[PDB]
Design a protein around this ligand. Structure first.
Ligand SMILES: [Zn+2]
Ligand SMILES: [Zn+2]
Length: 183
């Protein structure tokens, strides 16, 4: 009934309709509460498959990473990001960890309803991600700025600094602090 899993789940969708999926999912899984959330494709984002940004809440999905993947990857990424958005909109985003019990409650619930496999972790380009595993996010306004949306992801444990050639502009236009979120 709310089941998402059929033969096509495993297959690429030539013509995904992101706005339609968002409207469907808001209705079917989030009690209509994500009406004011903006979801868009990003054509240059490659650092992440999906992100959120918070003022109003915005979701972006990577066209380069998702357009030719099976439709389960678009859907599971979108639902993952919508759970973050829901915790934001409902002022329930106070868990210490990125994906704490509150995230995981919705993940389990929607997986149960749909047969899907939303996860706390990413399920594609395993080797790229495995090595490029040190992640920071700026807690400043560049979070809304494409194509990085505040993220830095490195294969070594070296935090952003003045010896990055992109630093001066960042400090001048944004000025936020990079917070380490993954190792
Ligand atoms: Zn997440
Ligand atoms: Zn910044």
């Amino acid at each position: 009934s709310l089941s998402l899993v059929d033969a096509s789940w495993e297959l690429v969708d030539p013509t995904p309709d992101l706005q339609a999926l968002f409207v469907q999912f808001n209705d079917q899984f989030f009690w209509g509460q994500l009406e004011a959330v903006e979801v868009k494709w990003s054509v240059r984002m490659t650092l992440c498959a999906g992100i959120c940004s918070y003022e109003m809440c915005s979701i972006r999905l990577s066209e380069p990473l998702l357009k030719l993947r099976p439709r389960k990857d678009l859907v599971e990424t979108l639902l993952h990001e919508m759970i973050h958005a829901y915790l934001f909109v409902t002022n329930n985003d106070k868990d210490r960890e990125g994906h704490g019990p509150e995230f995981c409650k919705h993940m389990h619930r929607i997986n149960s309803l749909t047969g899907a496999n939303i996860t706390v972790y990413h399920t594609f380009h395993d080797e790229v991600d495995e090595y490029r595993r040190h992640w920071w996010r700026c807690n400043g306004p560049c979070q809304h700025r494409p194509p990085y949306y505040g993220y830095v992801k490195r294969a070594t444990n070296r935090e952003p600094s003045a010896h990055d050639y992109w630093w001066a502009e960042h400090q001048k236009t944004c000025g936020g602090t990079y917070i380490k979120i993954k190792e």
